[PDB]
Design a protein around this ligand. Structure first.
Ligand SMILES: Nc1nc2c(ncn2[C@@H]2O[C@H](COP(=O)(O)OP(=O)(O)O)[C@@H](O)[C@H]2O)c(=O)[nH]1
Lengths: 11, 331
């Protein structure tokens, strides 16, 4: 994931 | 890079107008917007401010300069952004979470598919879920943690219904907090255009996705302007003017332009460029902008027409065949 938005994954 | 150009689609009464107005209000409060004709710009600084509560969970650093939101939503405007794909770089598909997909939701899907415009879904009116207790302006991931568990359970049932429709349509989608690869699944972002809840994720996803994956389209090239006409109207003291979106280059006062009209290609010259007063005249506009263009001979311009600036009369003449060919593919 180059966007880094999968930092939200699990919320 | 220049600003991504963002269009808002979805069924009547699902909250398009409301959402665009909440975004603008949120941006005006952060600092706030830039005033363009038919469009509003949220600057990168403002997006970074609005996304501040997410800074520890996601990287919030922007290399785009901002996002340009087209202020008129829906399908007729989207049709007026088509070009030999679209001028739109990204779309928000608004779905009222209580109602689900309606007929204009599926029309918007077809248009998006045909023009290959990337998008996300804003699952709006989450404030209307029975039991919702608002935390205004908060990120979705913060406010949902404060709702009753039955509220999360209803929300997930409605999201699952959306995910089902989307899969049926050939398009994998998921709640944005259940995606690992944002190139492969369309993000569903729950929001409330009334309370502002979810607007921070909304803006962070748009900014994240556009700046990550669209850098080739968003490259600014210094050159004569390229644009599209969005509206044609009469303006007192200027005659027929056009409201346009400039997506590459620079448009200047006294530039020659070529535009499509009903009796063939129009070759004219910019007499004034108008922007909202903080109308005022400006000497030039750079991509991406919404601008109002006063020039002679625009009475018969076709909405949706390309507009191409030209350095000389001879390069203008050479553009007239392309413009007519474009206009034909758009009928
Ligand atoms: N409770 C609530 N009402 C909303 C929300 N967004 C839109 N509305 C209301 O729903 C109606 C339709 O919204 P509008 O923005 O006009 O819909 P559009 O036709 O898609 O542009 C109006 O009464 C809005 O006030 C929302 O998030 N929450």
């Amino acid at each position: 994931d180059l966007s880094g938005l999968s930092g939200m994954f699990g919320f | 890079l220049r600003q991504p150009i963002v269009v808002v689609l979805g069924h009547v009464d699902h909250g398009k107008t409301t959402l665009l107005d909440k975004i603008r209000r949120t941006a005006v409060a952060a600092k706030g917007i830039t005033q363009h004709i038919g469009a509003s710009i949220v600057p990168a600084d403002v997006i970074e401010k609005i996304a501040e509560p997410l800074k520890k969970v996601i990287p919030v650093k922007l290399v785009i300069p901002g996002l340009l939101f087209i202020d008129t939503p829906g399908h007729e405007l989207f049709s007026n952004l088509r070009r030999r794909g679209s001028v739109a770089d990204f779309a928000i598909l608004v779905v009222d979470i209580m109602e689900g997909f309606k007929p204009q939701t599926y029309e918007a899907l077809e248009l998006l598919k045909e023009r290959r415009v990337p998008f996300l879904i804003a699952a709006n009116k989450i404030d209307r879920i029975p039991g919702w207790k608002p935390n205004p302006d908060a990120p979705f991931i913060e406010t949902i943690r404060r709702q009753d568990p039955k509220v999360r359970e209803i929300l997930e049932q409605r999201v699952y219904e959306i995910v089902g429709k989307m899969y049926e349509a050939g398009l994998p989608a998921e709640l944005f907090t259940r995606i690992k690869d944002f190139r492969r699944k369309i993000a569903i972002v729950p929001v409330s255009a009334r309370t502002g809840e979810g607007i921070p994720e909304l803006l962070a996803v748009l900014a994240g996705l556009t700046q990550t994956y669209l850098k080739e389209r968003l490259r600014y090239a210094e050159g004569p302007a390229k644009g599209v006409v969005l509206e044609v109207k009469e303006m007192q003291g200027f005659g027929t003017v056009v409201d346009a979106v400039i997506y590459d280059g620079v448009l200047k006062k006294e530039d020659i332009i070529v535009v499509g009209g009903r009796e063939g290609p129009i070759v004219t010259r910019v007499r004034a460029l108008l922007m909202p007063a903080p109308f005022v005249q400006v000497d030039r506009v750079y991509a991406a902008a919404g601008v109002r263009i006063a020039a002679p001979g625009l009475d018969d311009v076709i909405a949706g027409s390309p507009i191409y600036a030209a350095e000389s009369e001879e390069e203008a003449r050479k553009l007239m065949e392309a413009v007519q060919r474009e206009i034909e593919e758009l009928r």
